[model samples]
Target chain A: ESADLRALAKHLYDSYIKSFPLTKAKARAILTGDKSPFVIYDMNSLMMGEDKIKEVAIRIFQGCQFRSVEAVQEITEYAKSIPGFVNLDLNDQVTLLKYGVHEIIYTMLASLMNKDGVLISEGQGFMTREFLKSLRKPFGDFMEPKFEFAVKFNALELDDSDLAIFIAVIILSGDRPGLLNVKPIEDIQDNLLQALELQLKLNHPESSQLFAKLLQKMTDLRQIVTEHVQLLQVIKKHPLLQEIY
Target chain B: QLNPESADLRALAKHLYDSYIKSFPLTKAKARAILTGKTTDKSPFVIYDMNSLMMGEDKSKEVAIRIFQGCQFRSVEAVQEITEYAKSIPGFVNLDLNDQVTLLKYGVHEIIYTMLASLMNKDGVLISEGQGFMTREFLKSLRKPFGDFMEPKFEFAVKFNALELDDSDLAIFIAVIILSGDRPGLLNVKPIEDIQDNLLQALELQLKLNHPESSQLFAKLLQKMTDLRQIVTEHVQLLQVIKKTETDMSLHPLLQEIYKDL
Candidate 1:
């Protein structure tokens, strides 16, 4: 029950991180190159009028959401490929995806965040602290916490296997408010949680608190997502973002 | 009365109502006195004296273990009590039995910490049946693993206590915690969500009437739930460390079950 699941989690995490192009290493490599990297906007660019600021916000938001849609598809397919996930009722699967995807997306986003802020669109775009704060009212407030959480989370220095198992646990969670078939979902989550613990033991043998630290990171992820959903609601109120939603 | 069609709901509401009134019978003055260790009244349970234990012989280590064990035991008791209270809620027990257990397992710690926040003062938490107060600084003075765990929780407890909520507020707040619709494994989300919605509405109404000066009180209370989640996460992690490496002391079976996965 444990060993095989941990291996599968590791494989899934590896593939997902590999598929995610905006890794810190990738960003560092891109920055080292001679070609000026793709710059979305800086503080000066954001200082333009409301129309221009909104346009930049729309572009950045759309780009992130576009990539997020791809990431969501890839994650759903990956979860389906896992052993017991597809066996659940299709509606249950959809329910899990509906509530859990944002958490997973933010978990992936955590990897992109350093002390500064998140790197987006394959490292070609960066949402720096000052720039994010300068954005229109709620949008800036919406993203600040994620950056803060990401920076703190990245400090833990979790390896890919740990993250894979963690993400699996998040996906398999039966705690989503409206689940119809919680037992199987919980059963799968329990297995993933156990598998994650086992993997953490092997991966971080010297650090006894690492497993707990990782679990704390999951809680942080949940907090971030809860706030993120609120921000999404606020965003949906905007006419332009409303169209996208 | 809220859901008159179901006798179970009516009975559960009564149970919740009665339990809130009967338990934690300390007045704000008495609670403050107990937390400051200034009163002659003693708690029913044996309180571990943090100051003395720190300065004592090698026995200090043993006492620390005992304190942790006692704390864990007391927390599990709170969990069981809350679970019983949850079961008594009208629509709560009607949820799939597995879902019931799932909610309890995931939510028990959050409830425990929320109650702890209510019990706390500006300085520290009242422990050992309120016979003693464990200062935040004293808690941070313990060995690294245990000491580190107290920081986040103490930080939250101080902030939460600042809300200055009363028993009625905590009673409804706890109902919101146990009947949370957001817990992952619910079999029938609508009924549970309905209950939560009812609770939230009631809570909002209660808050509005209770704190007329603070219009944002309801939103602030909800935000505290998020903070509580963060605190419980760290506490659960501390429990994991104690369970895994500290074989000198035994954890309650219930506590073991709660901390098993993480």
Candidate 2:
């Protein structure tokens, strides 16, 4: 089977130049419309398949954009070479979440998004929250880095109070206030729901349908978590728990 | 003598204690040295464990290993923790029990592997002396059919070893294995001269399936593998010519230094 090399190359190049991001200025220029040679070739690769594109995409991200291909290559190579990573760490629910967020963020920024001119920083802001939560859910673990990210985001100049609320939710969830007696369950629930509502409200104008979709998804997540919380509470009250503690 | 009522609990506590003992890099080794009374600094004769030796603590490793020689495994938490640590090291999972003991004595990967393997196969009865080494508290926690204990037994342990394997080689293997595992209408790979083609197919599936997290990790993993393949290939070619000429192979100081960890 024959494929369009030029188109593939251009797709590879464009994607590389955009999300691969060498600097803020370069990113802005590419986003606005400065077409480089790599950009053209990268776009062509887009026609082929994503893995082919990603191979080139990562090269670009680590190479041209980051200008530290050697360092990135070494660290990743070392990490992968360790048998434990592939056999166990890769499968850990929490570990999977970590990788999952990476996958989501990269895919959203690179291949899936409808927009062509999105900045990497902007992409990070939009995707980090969803990605972080999605990552945590499968494993039922609170990652310190994600929590730290939320805290940092809260203090960032995003201006959007909705962002702040979500950050607060992550912080609270991560701290596991449920395990503590300082806050009543009702108060925590109210705070969490309010934060979610604030985010849903802001997200509504972006797409009314998307807002409802997110709300439904959140409801499902809440249901699952509520069940988990109840189970944990039961586990804590169990005679075995008292003996162990 | 151990009481029958708490025999199992005692064993579990011993396992936890064993775990704590095994965790210290030097302690495990010192215990082995005492058992064998044969002292040779060299164990695996591979760069892998040698690297660990350089990185690992000397004194504490000795003390920990000594503790295990006298102690039994206790506490499921302790047992799980120790097992996890063993799983973290490379070349441990596939090793035999004797090799594991040897590794443990020397603050290597084997001790950790044996601890977990024994636990996994333990049927609540003290079938072997290995199982008896563990404590009752540890056993009680593991009574649940399956749980987080598996995390150490499986995930962390395996990933730690995977991290220490040869990069370019393992990545290709993992990619093939994962893709070929047939998850209905996803990532069906056909031979392509360009490996990138297969990688791209997997990536697209990741995107389509809305598995953004996996996609990103895969991308990063694939990218590293690709770069590693390039480097190793170049180094092999360089070695071939250098070997034929009887020339010094001390080239690429910067590259070599960077690859020291590998």
TM-score of chain A of each: 0.82, 0.26
Please report the candidate that would top DockQ against the real structure.
1
Candidate 1: stretches off by over 4 Å? A1-245, B1-17, B23-30, B36-51, B54-61
Per-residue lDDT of model 1, residues A79-102, tens digit only: 775558989988889988988889
lDDT leader: 1
Model 1 chain A scores worst on lDDT over the 10 consecutive residues at A45-54
Docking class of 1: incorrect
Model 2, range B1-262, lDDT digits (tens) per residue?
A: 5456345433433343344445533332333332233445422211123333333323133322222222223222333444455543333445445444332222211223323332222222111222122222333343222112223333322322332222222222232222221111222222211222333333333332333333223322232222222233343344445446534323334333323432
Each prediction's total of clashing residue pairs, residues at least 3 apart in sequence or on different chains, is 10, 97
Runs off by more than 4 Å, candidate 2:
A1-59, A63-112, A115-164, A175-192, A198-245, B1-262
Looking at model 1, the pairs that clash are A174-B184, A174-B185, A175-B183, A175-B184, A175-B185, A176-B184, A177-B181, A177-B182, B9-B90, B12-B88
Model 1 Cα RMSD, 1 decimal: 21.3
